Design a protein around this ligand. Structure first.
Ligand SMILES: Nc1ncnc2c1ncn2[C@@H]1O[C@H](COP(=O)(O)OP(=O)(O)OP(=O)(O)O)[C@@H](O)[C@H]1O
Ligand SMILES: [Mg+2]
Lengths: 173, 459, 592, 55, 464
């Protein structure tokens, strides 16, 4: 009887040993999915930086990326933080930005929009602008990197459906 | 075809903070604040803490910070409004994962590959779409399997106190809670590392990590996340049980600690308090948590909540146990007196109750004598307690023959029937046979609660 | 630099302080009083100053230090006494030449003039050092030798230069660590915020017992090295004496004795007596004071500083735990910490919750008690420490229904309840054996089977004897003892003997100041063998009255076994006890 | 019993090889649908909506 | 020599505020105040010309909240002028105070001159450095057998006296004052009256005069007629006087704080006047801190031979230890001397119940060099056997005297001869600690040698 009791304790350790290896291998597959997913987003960042390089194609990008952010602020004055590369482009498109904001919003076009002297980091921000309130208090990070981060955070289920198909376990919804 | 949408919504970074009273951060110049909306407080240090909006004025938006307000300033703290309520990324891969109180994994694994984002608060399940739980869970515990039966879809807490083996009893039920396998969603709200390690070891030894999800909000973790943990665990359980058709056994622990978190938030908000300072809406919050368990029409899954509630001063009249017993479908009462006597499990059967026992302990589901035996055992145990009081007060010789027989019944009921020890695994039929062995002490004439047909058949 | 706007009690709402952080340390007033920010209502920022508020004028400057309340860990802590905010009372007295504590004294938390022998560790130039790794050790005193110098947590990088062996002060550079091209200079000491627990690699399930030295605590309700402990009881029950005896005679490597709301005379007694006592650890007789530091924040000291005292003490314990030592914090009154919290909350205006104690009291107590536990230190080389928090709760009115007591019972694992009925009549330790419980009896079975295999069985037998005698006394007190059986009389007599001789321990008597684990086990064996022999002899047919008359000598020998001085040693004391059982067995066979 | 117990815990290469197929399948699916998923993510990021708050 | 005098020669004009934003309860709120302090004492001049004295308690921006000691009755917004002294309350302290009778607010009611102050000391004081505080280990032969054998009092102990309303606590406390002396070879008593009646105050004055201690007493009489707010500052004045006379004059001081229940009632009234927390039984949550500020000012300090011993006299409402006042007082102080209504009704003087009584400074100051080597063992055995006797008496009442055993009968006899001969003592009879120990040894000699399990066997052999 004593030997049988000792074997029971050893057997319970074998289950823990098998479970620990099973869980470790199970998280290996899950970490492979995240690593594969990170390749999707890292490749997207490379093309997002590539699209910013195309000066002609980036002109309508910064048209929307500024007016869309200004329409959320709904402030008559704004401060635009942007890369030093895009400062001239914004200075050229400022009138179009004012007209588009005044058209999309029922209010009059914003009184004064000024490009902040402090420019975005070249390594981190690869495009877009970070507009702000007149007092530089309420700001919207509308950069391409921030937009991609928001998308990668809040669009995961559709990426799952595209890549790994539907969920076999799921039955409703 | 499943419809999921790609969309990018910019989020305003509000630098304006005008109050960090307690665990509440008060903003000043929010544009169209949204009630019950997740915000991210980027601290001056750099770390971000999640927050939830509890009240909005014309321009203010009071935010409760889950990770606490320690280190929050006004000049360099920016609050980023996500524009949507909290949506935990749910997936069938959550089984085997250990999450924090805020849903962030702590098992040294990747972020959960979301299959869908579900609102934490959920929605009230349609009463017409519910199914009355009739399948009886044959928990190994004799004091439960008999005399207070648990069904698939029941919300039956464990009313315990400080030092009582509520963790051991719940872990025993989880080990052996088969029908007459169960996925487990374990929510830890402010329990100590001893209890968390016990449960984790308990699951690993029994092999439950293949099909369990843990939300460990330890005592070291911030106290406000005790509000968010049970909702996260129960929406994960709802996802599994309904959208996946699993049989989830949700085990909340320290619901008293959750209510203490509510009181801490309610006191900070300076709201009008209820009994013992608890919020006047604590009944509604506890009901929202508890009523997320049950069977649903069409779906082949169920949720069986067993929230481990520790009564603060072993008093069932406390607001937390009172409202929990009023909301839930019963209670398992762990007795300090029985624990002192050395009885395990120290389940005091008299205060314990199972409202679904009546439908789950009929003929066909179990033996035809379950209800009669349970009622007779209850009556004789009450008579035994009264006889013990009479022996304590008046002289023992004054006790009648029935009183002496009932004292003997109490002795053998507590010391042989209730006393079970871990790993015992008494089947319902074996427990009923042992209960009959207990009831065979009395002559068949004395057994009033037993119907004559059952008495003739089984005595 | 802000300004003071409102001073009402120990809280100071200081205006013109936009940018102050929560719990950020400030300097309120011209005397630079130490305070912590609680609320920030706009530019206003309510501060709980840790000093006396008398004399603060509206308009006094308030400096913003920028860092939270930070204890100053490092060499020199071990034999000192602190003021709650880690101000050395000896340094304050020497600098002020006054028996009082002046308001705003800014003496360094650690002596800077003292030169410490430094011995570099296995690390050298170029080795990648991580947070919590030991890059050297210093000789602090004869008892606590090699006070290992730890790299601060959250500090990491490659070692650029290390100081060679020699003598160094705390301000002198000891190490230079390069992280991402930025050099960081490290000294012998390092600061740490008291609010945040010091990180550990992984906590472990505590298994080695904390030998308190008291018979009942060590046998009936044992405590492990690394587990929270609660000692409720009214005034005069024995909580302070139990705490002091545990600090004097425990198997812990270091003691962090924290007194919040305790009298200054208890602190004076500890300072006077601890150097006199000696310990047999480390292979030599060294004073107890060489491995115990005191965080003294008495009851007449500022109210808000009790929380700072608790947190400073627990952080010192966590530091000596990260050093791999077996430390045991002794908070003298968690109830007084809670009363300080209640006073601050009432002055602020928060909702009273229960009894007036703030609604966050339970969470704060849970976090503080969760700081404790056996753990593996953060960095290499691998070493394991533990913090045992044995805090004496002081219920209001002598009732265990107080909110502080309820929260402490909910969070802790060991509950040494004290009954004032036994506190009177000089029955110390006045432990209530009916309500007290210890949840480490299950885990301690490994140690018991390894060293004293019969210890758990004997403890269970004594517990059931005590329970049976409690029931018998309850029935007798109302129905007399004219109907008890012989077995009942034996149980009552043996349990009265246990209460009078074994359970009660005179901690101030030489024989019973410290009953070690082996002596306690042997005396449990003696008492249980006496009870078993009496039961067997009476069951054989001997009348209990005649048996007691014949075996009064054996009963006296058993009851006087406490007088065996443990200083004789394990071999001598156990030799006498083996003869005690043999004589008792003979005197129960000859009589029968 | 001790000899049998030791053999049980040594078994990890089989478990490692079992998941090795899953990693290959994940890598294949990623290499197959990277173009499509990255292109649709790019379309979503590049094409915003100038939408004013409803209120 | 003494450089503190030079700071005295400095006139400082004080603002006279006619601005009163409003008065509510015992608090008067001032407005437009120029840089208020937090405890500065202010002198309100009422329209009738009488000058109340108050101290600010909360100071917002240009606003101060004064509570006056003599009540707010008669205060008008238009005519009252407040003068801001600019410093907290400071009693004028001199060595000539020994022998004087002052009032609740420190004013001399002795019909003599104002005290020729040697130094102005803040009444609140400062906490004594625990490093600078010596552990009191010198017994005091109070004469009373109970307080000298079972509750021995050290030189710096702050052991109070717990009693009910009608008990003779004043008679016992006066006995201690006239008999206080070291066991191994005069105390300067400082008496503070807080809300006591005229009969009690006159009894204390006449007893001091009769025993000749009045030449070494500075009485602070604050009768029931006196305003109920200055019961707060009266013990502060007494303890400041004692702190001076001990730590700067090298005098061993007895501090008697009678009717601390009345002081705590005044504290509760002040707390309930504001919106403060109610603690337990209505008493403020900071009552522990205030009582600590009072009590913890006793003790001996390093380098200074002066010592202060506190004998506060409480009044338990229902003779209950569980009441907040006795509970917190026993938590803070270093013991208690419990005066028993049951013993008083039985006819014992002093009616001290030793079981609730405790002396924490007995462990030290009881030993083989300070007292006789058998003192601790004798006291422990006496408590054990007296409690056993009380339990046996209860069992006698429950199940008749016949059911008791030989041990219970011996316990009853010991209790009878202990309460009747040992605790009982003449009001003017003092017993040396050695004589009291001899009587205790006789009481133990009632018992057989075997049953004495609290006596170390060497002591039992040597002293039986
Ligand atoms: N183990 C013991 N052995 C001998 N005497 C003891 C023991 N414990 C307590 N005593 C005696 O009882 C007294 C109780 O004082 P103690 O400091 O223990 O009180 P406490 O319960 O901690 O009070 P407080 O709540 O006021 O801090 C001691 O001063 C001592 O005289
Ligand atoms: Mg104490």
């Amino acid at each position: 009887g004593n030997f049988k009791s000792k074997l029971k304790k050893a057997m319970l350790s074998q289950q823990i040993t098998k479970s620990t290896i099973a869980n470790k291998m199970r998280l290996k597959v899950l970490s492979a999915r995240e690593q594969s997913l990170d390749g999707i987003f890292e490749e997207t960042k490379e093309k997002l930086s590539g699209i910013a390089n195309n000066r002609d194609e980036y002109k309508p990008i910064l048209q929307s990326l500024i007016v869309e952010a200004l329409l959320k602020l709904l402030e008559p004055k704004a401060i635009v933080k942007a890369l030093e590369r895009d400062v001239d482009l914004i200075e050229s498109m400022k009138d179009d930005i004012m007209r588009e904001y005044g058209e999309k919003a029922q209010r009059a076009p914003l009184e004064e929009i000024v490009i902040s002297n402090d420019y975005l980091n070249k390594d981190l921000v690869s495009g877009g602008v970070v507009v702000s309130n007149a007092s530089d208090k309420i700001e919207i990070n509308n950069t391409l990197e921030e937009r991609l981060k928001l998308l990668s955070e809040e669009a995961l289920p559709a990426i799952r459906l595209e890549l790994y198909g539907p969920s076999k376990t799921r039955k409703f919804f | 075809a499943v419809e999921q949408g790609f969309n990018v919504k910019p989020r305003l970074n509000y630098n304006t903070v005008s109050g960090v009273n307690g665990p509440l951060v008060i903003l000043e110049k929010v544009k169209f604040p949204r009630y019950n909306e997740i915000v991210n407080l980027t601290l001056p240090d750099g770390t971000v803490r999640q927050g939830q909006v509890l009240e909005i004025r014309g321009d203010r938006a009071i935010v409760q910070v889950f990770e606490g307000t320690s280190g929050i300033d006004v000049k360099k703290t920016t609050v980023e409004f996500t524009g949507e309520s909290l949506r935990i990324p749910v997936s069938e891969d959550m089984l085997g994962r250990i999450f924090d109180g805020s849903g962030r994994p702590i098992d040294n694994g990747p972020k959960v590959f979301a299959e869908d984002y579900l609102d934490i608060n959920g929605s009230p399940i349609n009463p017409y779409a519910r199914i009355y739980p009739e399948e009886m869970i044959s928990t190994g515990v004799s004091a439960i399997d008999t005399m207070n039966s648990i069904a698939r879809g029941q919300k039956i807490p464990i009313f315990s106190a400080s030092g009582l083996p509520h963790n051991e009893i719940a872990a025993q039920i989880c080990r052996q809670a088969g029908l007459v396998n169960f996925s487990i969603v374990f929510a830890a709200m402010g329990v100590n590392l001893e209890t968390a390690r016990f449960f984790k070891q308990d699951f690993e030894e029994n092999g439950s990590l293949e099909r369990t999800s843990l939300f460990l909000n330890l005592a070291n973790d911030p106290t406000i996340e005790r509000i968010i943990t049970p909702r996260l665990a129960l929406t994960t359980a709802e996802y599994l049980a309904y959208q996946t058709e699993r049989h989830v056994l949700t085990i909340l622990t320290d619901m008293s600690s959750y209510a203490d978190a509510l009181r801490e938030v309610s006191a900070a908000r300076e709201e009008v308090p209820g009994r013992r300072g608890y919020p006047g809406y604590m009944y509604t919050d506890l009901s929202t948590i508890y009523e997320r368990a049950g069977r649903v029409e069409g779906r082949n899954g169920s949720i069986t909540q067993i929230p481990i509630l520790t009564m603060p001063n072993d008093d069932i009249t406390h607001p937390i146990p009172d409202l929990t017993g009023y909301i839930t479908e019963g209670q398992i009462f762990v007795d300090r007196q029985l624990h002192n006597k050395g009885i395990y499990p120290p389940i005091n059967v008299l205060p314990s109750l199972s409202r679904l026992m009546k439908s789950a302990i009929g003929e066909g589901m179990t033996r035809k004598d379950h209800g009669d035996v349970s009622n007779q055992l209850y009556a004789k145990y009450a008579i035994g307690k009264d006889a013990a009081a009479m022996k304590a007060v008046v002289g023992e010789e004054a006790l009648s023959i029935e009183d002496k027989l009932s004292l003997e019944f109490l002795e053998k009921f507590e010391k042989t029937f209730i006393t079970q020890g871990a790993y015992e695994d008494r089947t319902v039929f074996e427990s009923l046979d042992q209960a009959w062995s207990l009831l065979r002490i009395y002559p068949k004439e004395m057994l009033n609660r037993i119907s004559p047909k059952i008495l003739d058949e089984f005595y | 630099y802000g300004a003071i706007y409102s001073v009402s009690g120990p809280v100071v709402i200081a205006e013109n302080m936009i940018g102050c952080a929560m719990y950020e340390l400030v300097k309120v007033g011209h005397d630079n009083l130490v305070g912590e920010v609680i609320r920030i209502d706009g530019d206003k920022a309510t501060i709980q100053v840790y000093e006396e508020t008398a004399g603060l004028t509206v308009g006094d400057p308030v400096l913003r230090t920028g860092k939270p309340l930070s204890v100053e860990l490092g060499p020199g802590l071990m034999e000192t006494i602190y003021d709650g905010i880690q101000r050395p009372l000896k340094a304050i007295k020497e600098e002020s030449q006054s028996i009082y504590i002046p308001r705003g004294i800014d003496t360094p938390a650690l002596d800077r003039t003292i030169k410490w022998q430094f011995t570099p560790g296995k690390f050298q130039v170029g080795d990648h050092i991580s947070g919590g790794d030991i890059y050297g050790s210093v000789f602090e005193n004869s008892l606590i030798s090699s006070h290992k110098i730890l790299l601060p947590p959250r500090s990491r990088g490659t070692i650029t230069w290390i100081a060679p062996a020699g003598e160094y002060t705390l301000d002198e550079k000891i190490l230079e660590v390069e992280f991402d091209g930025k050099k960081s200079d490290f000294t012998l000491y390092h600061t740490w915020p008291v609010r945040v627990p010091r990180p550990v690699t992984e906590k472990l399930s505590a298994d080695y017992p904390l030998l308190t030295g008291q018979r009942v605590l060590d046998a009936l309700f044992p405590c492990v090295q690394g587990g929270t402990t609660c000692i409720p009881g009214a005034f005069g029950c024995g909580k302070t004496v139990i705490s002091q005896s545990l600090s004097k005679y425990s198997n812990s490597d270091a003691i962090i004795y924290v007194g919040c709301g305790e009298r200054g005379n208890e602190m004076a007694e500890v300072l006077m007596e601890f150097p006199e006592l000696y310990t047999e650890m480390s292979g030599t007789k060294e004073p107890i004071m060489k491995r115990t530091t005191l965080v003294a924040n008495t009851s007449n000291m500022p109210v808000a500083a009790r929380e700072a005292s608790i947190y400073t003490g627990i952080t010192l314990a966590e530091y000596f735990r990260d050093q791999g030592k077996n430390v045991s914090m002794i908070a003298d009154s968690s109830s007084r910490w809670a009363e300080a919290l209640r006073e601050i909350s009432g002055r602020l205006g928060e909702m009273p919750a229960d009894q007036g104690f703030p609604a966050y009291l339970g969470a704060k107590l849970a976090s503080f008690y969760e700081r404790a536990g056996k753990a593996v230190a953060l960095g290499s080389p691998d070493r394991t420490g533990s913090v045992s928090i044995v805090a004496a709760v002081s219920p209001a009115g002598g009732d265990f229904s107080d909110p502080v007591t309820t929260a402490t019972l909910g969070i802790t694992q060991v509950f040494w309840g004290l009954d004032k009925k036994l506190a009177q009549r000089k029955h110390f330790p006045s432990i209530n054996t009916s309500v007290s419980y210890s949840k480490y009896t299950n885990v301690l079975n490994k140690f018991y089977d390894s060293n004293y295999p019969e210890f758990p069985v004997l403890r269970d037998r004594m517990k059931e004897i005590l329970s049976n005698a409690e029931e018998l006394e309850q029935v007798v007190q109302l129905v007399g003892k004219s109907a008890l059986s012989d077995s009942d009389k034996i149980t009552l007599d043996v349990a009265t003997l246990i209460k009078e001789d074994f359970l009660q321990q005179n901690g101030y008597s030489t024989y019973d100041a410290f009953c070690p684990i082996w002596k306690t086990f042997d005396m449990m064996r003696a008492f249980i063998s006496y009870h078993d022999e009496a039961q067997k002899a009476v069951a054989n047919g001997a009348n209990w009255s005649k048996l007691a008359d014949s075996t009064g000598d054996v009963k006296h020998a058993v009851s006087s076994s406490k007088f065996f001085e443990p200083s004789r040693g394990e071999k001598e004391v156990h030799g006498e006890f083996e003869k005690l059982l043999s004589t008792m067995q003979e005197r129960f066979a000859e009589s029968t | 019993e001790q000899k049998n117990a030791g053999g049980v815990g040594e078994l990890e290469k089989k478990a490692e090889a079992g998941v090795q197929g899953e990693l290959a399948e994940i890598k294949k699916i990623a290499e197959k649908k990277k173009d499509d998923v990255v292109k649709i993510l790019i379309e979503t990021v590049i094409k915003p909506s100038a939408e004013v708050h409803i209120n």
